[PDB]
Design a binder for this molecule. Structure first.
Ligand SMILES: Nc1ncnc2c1ncn2[C@@H]1O[C@H](COP(=O)(O)O)[C@@H](O)[C@H]1O
Lengths: 115, 113
């Protein structure tokens, strides 16, 4: 199916609700249901890729597009003091949804280390 | 390139533990590691921060991520890892040259700072 089997595929196909910030032919940005900062959203590809560790070389433009859309949405949402982008891979990364996605968190001071 | 310590590293003016290099990026271990494995992937093009990257940079930015995941595999991070890009003061960005952090070798926690 276009978008894959995960809950994010269901969001892509409008089968379950989401608070969408931006949508184009390649990706979708929507707010996280369990925000870890005053603003916390996800940017995901419409093509299903399970996790960054299995992305193909020809996925480079798409992955870069997630970041460009992330920074554009951050600006549009007024995160003028900055933000943090995160990709969680696998068990040590704490990954819970196996559809590649970029977190964007802001609206407060982010601390170091990043988890 | 550029007028930061990362520019000096790219130009080979100061040492760094280099993991991978090509014509457009460089990966090297972070000098202040926050996990048993903690390295950076940076473009050779001086983009000061992700907020000023242009559409034309999309494939370069994606290239950083692909290089990052390949380096992670080569460094034996088979249990996973976390990638991070910091922007500005709230993001805790330490150097104004875009850089992708890759951290692994321990459980990464939530929230991510
Ligand atoms: N239905 C949903 N809508 C929005 N965000 C979600 C939904 N289900 C899970 N998430 C978020 O997706 C992320 C998945 O975890 P991880 O794979 O570590 O990034 C978490 O931040 C969740 O809160």
């Amino acid at each position: 199916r276009p978008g894959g089997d995960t809950i994010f595929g269901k969001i892509i196909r409008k089968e379950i609700p989401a608070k969408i910030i931006f949508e184009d032919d390649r990706c979708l940005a929507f707010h996280d249901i369990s925000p870890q900062a005053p603003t916390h959203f996800l940017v995901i590809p419409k093509k299903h890729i399970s996790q960054i560790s299995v992305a193909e070389d020809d996925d480079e433009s798409l992955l870069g597009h997630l970041m460009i859309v992330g920074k554009k949405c951050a600006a549009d949402l007024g995160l003028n003091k900055g933000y943090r982008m995160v990709v969680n891979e696998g068990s040590d990364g704490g990954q819970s949804v196996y559809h590649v996605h970029l977190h964007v968190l802001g609206g407060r001071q982010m601390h170091w280390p990043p988890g």
